[PDB]
Every structure is written in structure tokens, then in C-alpha cells.
Short mmCIF file of C-alpha atoms in Angstrom, two decimals:
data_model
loop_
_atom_site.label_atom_id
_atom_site.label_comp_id
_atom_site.label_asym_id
_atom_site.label_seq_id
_atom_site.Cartn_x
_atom_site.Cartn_y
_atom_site.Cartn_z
CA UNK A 9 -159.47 0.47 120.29
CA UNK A 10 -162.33 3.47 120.85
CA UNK A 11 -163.86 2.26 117.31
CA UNK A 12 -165.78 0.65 120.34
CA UNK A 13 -166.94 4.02 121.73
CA UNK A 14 -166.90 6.23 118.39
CA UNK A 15 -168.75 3.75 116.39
CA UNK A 16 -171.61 3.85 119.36
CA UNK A 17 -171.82 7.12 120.25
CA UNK A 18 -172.70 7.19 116.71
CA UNK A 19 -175.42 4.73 116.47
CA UNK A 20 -176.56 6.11 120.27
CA UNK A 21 -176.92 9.44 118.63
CA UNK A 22 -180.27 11.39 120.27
CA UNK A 23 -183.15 12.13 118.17
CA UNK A 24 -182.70 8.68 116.33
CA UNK A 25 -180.97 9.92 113.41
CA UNK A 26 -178.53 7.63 112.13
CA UNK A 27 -180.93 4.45 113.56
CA UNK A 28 -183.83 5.80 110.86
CA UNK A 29 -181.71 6.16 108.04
CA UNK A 30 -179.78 2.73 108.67
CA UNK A 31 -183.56 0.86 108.82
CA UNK A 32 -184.92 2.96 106.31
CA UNK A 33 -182.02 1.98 103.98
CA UNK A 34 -180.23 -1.23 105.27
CA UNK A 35 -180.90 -4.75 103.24
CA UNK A 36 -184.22 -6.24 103.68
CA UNK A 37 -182.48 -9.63 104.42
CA UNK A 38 -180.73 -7.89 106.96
CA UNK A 39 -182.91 -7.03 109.36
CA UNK A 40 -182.67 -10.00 111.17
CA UNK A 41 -179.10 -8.57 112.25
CA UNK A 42 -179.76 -4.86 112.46
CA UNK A 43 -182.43 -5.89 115.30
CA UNK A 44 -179.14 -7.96 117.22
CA UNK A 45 -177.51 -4.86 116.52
CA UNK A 46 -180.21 -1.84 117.63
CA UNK A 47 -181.34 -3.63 120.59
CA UNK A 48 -177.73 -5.13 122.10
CA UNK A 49 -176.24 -1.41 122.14
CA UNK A 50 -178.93 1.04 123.29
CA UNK A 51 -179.46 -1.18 126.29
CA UNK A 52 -175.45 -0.62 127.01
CA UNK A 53 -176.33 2.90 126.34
CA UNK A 54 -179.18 3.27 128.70
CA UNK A 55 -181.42 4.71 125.89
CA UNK A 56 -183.63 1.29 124.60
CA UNK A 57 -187.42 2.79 125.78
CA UNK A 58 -186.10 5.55 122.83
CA UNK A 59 -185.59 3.29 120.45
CA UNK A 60 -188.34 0.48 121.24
CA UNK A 61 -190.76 3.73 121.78
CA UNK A 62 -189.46 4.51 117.99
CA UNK A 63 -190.09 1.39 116.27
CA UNK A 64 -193.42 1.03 118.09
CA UNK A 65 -195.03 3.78 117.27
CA UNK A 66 -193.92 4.52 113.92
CA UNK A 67 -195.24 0.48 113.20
CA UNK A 68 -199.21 1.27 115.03
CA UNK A 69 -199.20 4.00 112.66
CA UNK A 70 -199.67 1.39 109.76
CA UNK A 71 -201.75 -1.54 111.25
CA UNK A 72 -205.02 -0.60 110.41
CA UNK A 73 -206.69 -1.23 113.33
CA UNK A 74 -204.51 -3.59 115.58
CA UNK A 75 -205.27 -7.30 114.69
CA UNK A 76 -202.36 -7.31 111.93
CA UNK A 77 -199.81 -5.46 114.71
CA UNK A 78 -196.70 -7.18 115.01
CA UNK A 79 -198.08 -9.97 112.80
CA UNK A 80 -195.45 -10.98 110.68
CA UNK A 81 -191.69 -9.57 109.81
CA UNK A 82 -191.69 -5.58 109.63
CA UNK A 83 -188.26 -4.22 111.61
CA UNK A 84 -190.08 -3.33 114.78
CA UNK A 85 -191.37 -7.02 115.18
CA UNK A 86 -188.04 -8.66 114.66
CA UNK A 87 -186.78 -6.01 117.28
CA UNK A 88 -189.96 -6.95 119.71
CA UNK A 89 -188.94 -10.55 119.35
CA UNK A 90 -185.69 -10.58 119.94
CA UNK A 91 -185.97 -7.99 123.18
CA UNK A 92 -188.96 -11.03 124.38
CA UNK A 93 -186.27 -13.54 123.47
CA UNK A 94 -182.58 -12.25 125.00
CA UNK A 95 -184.51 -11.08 128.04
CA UNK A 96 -186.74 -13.86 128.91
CA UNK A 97 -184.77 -17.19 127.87
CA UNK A 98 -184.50 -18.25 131.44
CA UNK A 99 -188.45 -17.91 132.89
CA UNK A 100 -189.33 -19.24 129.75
CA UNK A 101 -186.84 -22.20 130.76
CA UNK A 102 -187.66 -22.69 133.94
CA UNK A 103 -191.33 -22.24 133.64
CA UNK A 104 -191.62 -24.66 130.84
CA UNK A 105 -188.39 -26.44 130.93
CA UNK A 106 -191.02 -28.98 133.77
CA UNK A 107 -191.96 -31.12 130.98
CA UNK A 134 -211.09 -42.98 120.79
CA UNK A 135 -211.76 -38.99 120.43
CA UNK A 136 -213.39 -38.67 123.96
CA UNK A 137 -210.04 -39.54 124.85
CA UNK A 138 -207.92 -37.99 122.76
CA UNK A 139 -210.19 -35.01 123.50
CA UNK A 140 -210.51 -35.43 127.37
CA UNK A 141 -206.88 -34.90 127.99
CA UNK A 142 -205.93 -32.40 125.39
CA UNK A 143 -207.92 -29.88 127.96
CA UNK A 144 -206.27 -31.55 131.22
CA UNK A 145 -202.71 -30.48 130.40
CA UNK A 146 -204.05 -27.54 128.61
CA UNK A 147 -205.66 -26.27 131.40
CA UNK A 148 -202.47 -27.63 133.87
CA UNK A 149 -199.83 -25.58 131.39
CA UNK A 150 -201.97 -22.40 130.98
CA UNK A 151 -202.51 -22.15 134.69
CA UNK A 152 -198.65 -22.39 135.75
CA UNK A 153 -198.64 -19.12 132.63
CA UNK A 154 -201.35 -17.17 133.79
CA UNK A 155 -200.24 -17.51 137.89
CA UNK A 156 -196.29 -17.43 137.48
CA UNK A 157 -196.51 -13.16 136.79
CA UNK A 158 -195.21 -13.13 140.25
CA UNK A 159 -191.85 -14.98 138.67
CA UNK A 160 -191.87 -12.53 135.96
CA UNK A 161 -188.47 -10.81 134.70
CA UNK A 162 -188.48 -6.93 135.38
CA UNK A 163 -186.51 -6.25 132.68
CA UNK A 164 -189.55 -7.57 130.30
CA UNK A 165 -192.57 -5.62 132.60
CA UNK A 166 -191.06 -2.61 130.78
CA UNK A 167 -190.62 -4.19 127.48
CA UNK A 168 -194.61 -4.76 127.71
CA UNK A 169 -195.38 -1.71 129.50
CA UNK A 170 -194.05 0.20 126.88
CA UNK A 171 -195.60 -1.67 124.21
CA UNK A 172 -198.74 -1.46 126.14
CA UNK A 173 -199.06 2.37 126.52
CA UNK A 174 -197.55 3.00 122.42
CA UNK A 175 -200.95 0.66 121.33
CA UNK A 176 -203.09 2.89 124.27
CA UNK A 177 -201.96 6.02 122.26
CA UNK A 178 -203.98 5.11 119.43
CA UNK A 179 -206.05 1.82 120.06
CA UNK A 180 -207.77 1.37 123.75
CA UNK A 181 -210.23 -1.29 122.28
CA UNK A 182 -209.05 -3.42 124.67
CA UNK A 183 -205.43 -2.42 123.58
CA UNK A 184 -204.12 -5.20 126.24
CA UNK A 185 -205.12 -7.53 123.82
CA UNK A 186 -202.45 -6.72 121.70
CA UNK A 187 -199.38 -7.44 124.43
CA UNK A 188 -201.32 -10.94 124.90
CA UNK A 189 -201.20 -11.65 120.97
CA UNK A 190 -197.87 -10.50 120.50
CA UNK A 191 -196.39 -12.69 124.01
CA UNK A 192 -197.92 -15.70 122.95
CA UNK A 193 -197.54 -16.10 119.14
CA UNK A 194 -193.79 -15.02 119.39
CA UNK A 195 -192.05 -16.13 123.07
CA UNK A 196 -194.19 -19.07 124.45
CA UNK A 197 -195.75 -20.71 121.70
CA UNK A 198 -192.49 -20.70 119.46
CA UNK A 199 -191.21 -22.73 122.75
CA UNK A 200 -193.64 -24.93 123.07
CA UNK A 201 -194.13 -26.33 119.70
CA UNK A 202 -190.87 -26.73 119.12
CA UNK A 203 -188.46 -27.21 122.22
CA UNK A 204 -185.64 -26.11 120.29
CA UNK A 205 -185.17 -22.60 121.34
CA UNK A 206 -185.00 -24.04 125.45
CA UNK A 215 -194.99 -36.63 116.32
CA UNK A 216 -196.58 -38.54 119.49
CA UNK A 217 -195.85 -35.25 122.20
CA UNK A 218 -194.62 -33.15 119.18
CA UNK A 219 -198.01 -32.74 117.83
CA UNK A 220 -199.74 -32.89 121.43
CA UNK A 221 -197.93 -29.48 121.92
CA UNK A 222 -198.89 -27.89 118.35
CA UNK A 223 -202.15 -28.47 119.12
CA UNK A 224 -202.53 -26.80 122.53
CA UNK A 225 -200.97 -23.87 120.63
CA UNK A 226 -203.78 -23.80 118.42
CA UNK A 227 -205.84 -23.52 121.49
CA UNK A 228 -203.71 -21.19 123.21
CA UNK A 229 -202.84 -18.80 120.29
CA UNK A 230 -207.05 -18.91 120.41
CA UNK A 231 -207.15 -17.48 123.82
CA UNK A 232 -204.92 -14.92 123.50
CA UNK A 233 -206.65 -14.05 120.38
CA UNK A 234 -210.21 -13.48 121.50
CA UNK A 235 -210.93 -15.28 118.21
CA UNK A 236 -213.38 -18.99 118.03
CA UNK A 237 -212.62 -21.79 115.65
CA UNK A 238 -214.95 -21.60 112.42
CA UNK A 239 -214.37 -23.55 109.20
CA UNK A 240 -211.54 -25.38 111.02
CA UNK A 241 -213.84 -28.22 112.36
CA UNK A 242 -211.65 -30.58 114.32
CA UNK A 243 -210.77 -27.68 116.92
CA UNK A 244 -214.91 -26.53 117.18
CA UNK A 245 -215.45 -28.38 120.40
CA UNK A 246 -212.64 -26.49 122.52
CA UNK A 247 -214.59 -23.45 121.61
CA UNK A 248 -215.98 -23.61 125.09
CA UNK A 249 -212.57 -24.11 127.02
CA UNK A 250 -211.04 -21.27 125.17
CA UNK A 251 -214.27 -18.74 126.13
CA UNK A 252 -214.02 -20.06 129.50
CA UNK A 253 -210.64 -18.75 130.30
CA UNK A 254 -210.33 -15.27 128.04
CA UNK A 255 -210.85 -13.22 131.04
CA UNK A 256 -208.57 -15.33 133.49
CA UNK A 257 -205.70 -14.17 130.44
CA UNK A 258 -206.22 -10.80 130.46
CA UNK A 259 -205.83 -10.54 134.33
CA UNK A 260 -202.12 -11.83 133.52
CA UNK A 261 -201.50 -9.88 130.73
CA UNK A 262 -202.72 -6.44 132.91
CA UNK A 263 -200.68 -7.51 135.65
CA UNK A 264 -197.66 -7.95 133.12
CA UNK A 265 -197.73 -4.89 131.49
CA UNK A 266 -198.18 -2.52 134.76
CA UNK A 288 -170.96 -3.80 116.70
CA UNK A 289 -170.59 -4.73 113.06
CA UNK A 290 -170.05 -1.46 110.76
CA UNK A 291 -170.13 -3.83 108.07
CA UNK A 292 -173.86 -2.27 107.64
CA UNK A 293 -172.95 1.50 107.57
CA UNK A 294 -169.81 1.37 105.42
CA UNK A 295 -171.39 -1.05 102.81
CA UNK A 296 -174.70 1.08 102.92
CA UNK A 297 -172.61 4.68 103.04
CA UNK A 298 -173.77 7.11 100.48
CA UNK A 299 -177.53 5.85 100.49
CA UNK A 300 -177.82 6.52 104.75
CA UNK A 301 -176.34 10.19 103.78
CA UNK A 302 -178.07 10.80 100.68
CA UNK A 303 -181.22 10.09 103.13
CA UNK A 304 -179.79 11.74 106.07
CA UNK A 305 -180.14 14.74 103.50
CA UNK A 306 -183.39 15.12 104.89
CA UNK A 316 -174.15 17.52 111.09
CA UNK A 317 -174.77 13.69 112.50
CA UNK A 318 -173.47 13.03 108.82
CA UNK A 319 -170.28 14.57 108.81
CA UNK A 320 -169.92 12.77 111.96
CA UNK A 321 -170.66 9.37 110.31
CA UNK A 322 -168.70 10.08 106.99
CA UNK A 323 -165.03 11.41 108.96
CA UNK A 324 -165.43 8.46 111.47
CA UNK A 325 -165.82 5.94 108.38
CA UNK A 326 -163.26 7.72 106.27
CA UNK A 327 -161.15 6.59 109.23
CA UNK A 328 -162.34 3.05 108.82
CA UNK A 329 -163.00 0.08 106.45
CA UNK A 330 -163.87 -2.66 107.45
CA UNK A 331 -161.17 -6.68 105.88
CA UNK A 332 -164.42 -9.00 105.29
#
């Protein structure tokens, strides 16, 4: 059974050959799987900084100056979020998994600054694996954008690993929306951005200011086999590939094919 060897030698293969063609070709919907798929077997391989180091900088040549970076579902976030997810599902566990508007206002900033502190102090608790995952990130961004550039591994960490979490303790209305609302003021921090228009959030302005530097500390000390995909996608990843890793990947299939 060295389809299990053959198949990722293939995908492995150095340069990033048959990885572009099968993400600048695969299904749009199917993204969501090629990111399983990429990240699971170039860890095995010992070659992920390659293809993380791929994705990222071919994605901060877009952008547009690096507010919109990783910012919705291109394949290079999906990827990002599933490395943050795989990787860190156990600190994120066991750092969260302990769990009249003068009131209702007097408290929201009580836990808020309780549950932010255990974030912004617990980088001494923080997977090694993921230090590389961000350090990587960190010095793709620094190769184009060192306006702060830090920023952007603090944007990307909270909108898509803790705040996911925390508004919805599903990946681990009274409390439900007592958490969404935090993340309104966290996802504010990390953003280095003040509420405006939206007036209900205008007087946390100050506790979010207060506390922009104390996240960037953090954030600096953080950052330093299905197939079913290439034989159904076959003569579109060669007819790309067309500008002999090909030959490779149309004798191994021709040996192949795949029931459902």
C-alpha cells in the first residue's frame, strides 16, 4: 500500500509545483479540504515553513496595504486557520476552558480586563509549534509592511483562534451575549481601531486605548490523503502545469482511480 508514499512524494514535491497548480485549479468549495489536506502532509514531510511561506507571501502581495490581510476566505487564510486551530486546541482549552447601564457597564470591563490579562500573561504557556506558525507569518508581512507589521499577527490570532472560542464555546443569550460583546471589545484592541457610528460600544473607547500597548508586548513575545482532488481535477492541473513533475503525476494516476 505505497499509494501512501507515491501519492506524497508527489504532493511534497520541491519548488511547490503540483501544490500551485492543485490551488490554482481545485473547486472553490473545496478549499476548505485542500487546506486539511496541504497542511496535514507537509508537516509529516518536514517541509510546512515552504508551504505556509508560499501561501503567505503570494496572499501580502494582494492586500493592499495590510488591514484586509487574512480578512476573509482566500486559500492561505483557511490554511492559517486551520494550522492556529489543529495546533493550538489544547492552550486554547485550558486557558479558556476556566469559565441599570452603570452596571451592566461596570462589569463588562471587570471580566474583560480579568480574561484579557490571563491572554496577554499566559505567552509563557504558549505552544512552540505555533511561535513558528506566527514567526513566520510575522517576518512574510515584515517583507513588505513594517508599519507596525505585528499588528497583523494580533488581528489575525484574535479574529480567527480566540474570539471564534469565545463567542461560541463550541469549538472547546444571558453569558452567550456577555461573551460576544467582550469580543467586540477585544477584536477592538487587537485592531488599533475606536468605536464610531456604533454608539452603544463608545464608552469602552477608553479601556480599549488603555491596553493597546500591553497587546502588542504579547503579540512580540509570540512571534519571536484523498486523490479524489487530483484525479477529478486531472487534465486542468497539467494543462496548467504546462507552464517532468507531470509525467510523474499522470503515470502514478494512470495507475490509480479512485471507487467514490
Amino acid at each position: 500500500e505505497r499509494l501512501v508514499e507515491l501519492v506524497t512524494m508527489m504532493g511534497d514535491q520541491g519548488e511547490l509545483p503540483i501544490a500551485m497548480a492543485l490551488a490554482n485549479v481545485v473547486p472553490c468549495s473545496q478549499w476548505d479540504e485542500l487546506a486539511r489536506v496541504l497542511v496535514t502532509l507537509f508537516d509529516s514531510r518536514h517541509l510546512l515553513y515552504q508551504l505556509l511561506w508560499n501561501m503567505f507571501s503570494k496572499e501580502v502581495e494582494l492586500a493592499d496595504s495590510m488591514q484586509t490581510l487574512f480578512r476573509g476566505n482566500s486559500l492561505a487564510s483557511k490554511i492559517m486557520t486551520f494550522c492556529f486551530k489543529v495546533y493550538g486546541a489544547t492552550y486554547l482549552q485550558k486557558l479558556l476552558d476556566p469559565l441599570s447601564l452603570e452596571e451592566n457597564q461596570r462589569n463588562l470591563l471587570q471580566m474583560t480586563e480579568k480574561f484579557f490579562h490571563a491572554i496577554i500573561s499566559s505567552s509563557s504557556e504558549f505552544p512552540p509549534q505555533l511561535r513558528s506558525v506566527c514567526h513566520c507569518l510575522y517576518q512574510v508581512v515584515s517583507q513588505r509592511f513594517p508599519q507596525n507589521s505585528i499588528g497583523a499577527v494580533g488581528s489575525a490570532m484574535f479574529l480567527r483562534f480566540i474570539n471564534p472560542a469565545i463567542v461560541s464555546p463550541y469549538e472547546a443569550p444571558i453569558i452567550e451575549r456577555g461573551l460576544k460583546l467582550m469580543s467586540k471589545i477585544l477584536q477592538s484592541i487587537a485592531n488599533h481601531v475606536l468605536f464610531t457610528k456604533e454608539e452603544h460600544m463608545r464608552p469602552f473607547n477608553d479601556f480599549v486605548k488603555s491596553n493597546f500597548d500591553a497587546a502588542r508586548r504579547f503579540f512580540l513575545d509570540i512571534a519571536s490523503a484523498l486523490h479524489r482532488l487530483l484525479w477529478n481535477n486531472q487534465e486542468k492541473i497539467g494543462q496548467y502545469l504546462s507552464s517532468r513533475p507531470f509525467d510523474k503525476m499522470a503515470t502514478l494516476l494512470a495507475y490509480l482511480g479512485p471507487p467514490e
